[PDB]
Amino acid sequence: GRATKSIPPIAFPD
């Protein structure tokens, strides 16, 4: 459930 708004937006199922 972790997503970065910083480029690149990487997302983790967390």
Q: How far apart are CA 9 and CA 1, in angstroms?
A: 12
Q: At 2, is the secondary structure helix, strand, or coil?
A: strand
Integer Cα distance of 13 and 7 in angstroms: 18
Query: Could you give the CA distance from residue 10 to residue 14 in angstroms, rounded to a whole number?
Result: 11
Give the integer Cα–Cα distance in Å for 7 and 4. 7
